[PDB]
Amino acid sequence: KFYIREPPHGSPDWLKVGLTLGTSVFLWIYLIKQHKEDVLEYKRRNGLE
């Protein structure tokens, strides 16, 4: 028990959890796409594939 109910909610702060997970997912997807584009661009320049 707590005398006052600890402003950081007893349930998760769904807004902050939401945009934190969203920015993590966005960063991972962007990094994957950047890596694929870099691989294709490097293969295109150097005459490999």
Residues in 1-49 at the binding interface with other proteins, rule: CB under 8 A: 1-3, 6-13, 17, 20-21, 23-24, 27-28, 30-32, 34-35, 38-39, 41-42, 45-46
DSSP-derived 3-state class of residue 7: coil
> What's the rounded Cα separation, in Å, for the pair 33 and 35?
5
Phi first, then psi, for residue 17 (nearest 5°) are -60, -45
Question: Measured from the CB of residue 3, what is the shortest distance to other proteins in angstroms?
Answer: 5
The H-or-E segment that residue 39 falls in is: helix 14-45
Q: At its nearest, how many Å lie between other proteins and the CB of residue 48?
A: 10
Largest CA distance in the chain: 70
**Residues near other proteins (CB under 8 A):** 1-3, 6-13, 17, 20-21, 23-24, 27-28, 30-32, 34-35, 38-39, 41-42, 45-46
